Ligand binder design. Structure first.
Ligand code: NA
Ligand code: NA
Lengths: 84, 84
């Protein structure tokens, strides 16, 4: 069981991305991403959509929003979450 | 393409739920849902998670967040969206 902030970090690390790489990919400012990863700010849904639409995060969508997976369709949990 | 507000309306109407019924199932107050549907307010990600975790909206998760579907795993667009 993970919070939004723990989930964003789990997705980013499992993709071996630095925060700066994630900022450059998503267009979310580094400082804002830092706030999201620390739990200081909760991402508005439109920003969250931008993050999950980043090509390598899309496979985490179901897990991220609903804590369910569907690997036959590519929907998985980040490796580092140790989901299941 | 549909905005967040439009997508919420599409999911609810496709599930033939009144707004009050959606309030009662999701536990999101009617006022808040009203503002989400009009665009007056944008849902925080935690609330959007709660909405998509409501059993009959889970199937729209991929479509809602990423504009993609995976029907083989039950991930579809709301019928009224006329997706594809
Ligand atoms: Na890297
Ligand atoms: Na109804």
């Amino acid at each position: 069981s993970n919070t939004i902030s723990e989930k964003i970090v789990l997705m980013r690390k499992s993709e071996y991305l630095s925060r700066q790489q994630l900022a450059d990919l998503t267009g979310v400012p580094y400082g804002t991403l830092s706030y999201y990863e620390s739990g200081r700010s909760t991402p508005p849904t439109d920003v969250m959509m931008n993050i999950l639409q980043t090509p390598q995060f899309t496979k985490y969508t179901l897990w991220f929003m609903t804590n369910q997976i569907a690997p036959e369709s590519g929907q998985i949990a980040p490796a580092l979450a140790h989901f299941g």
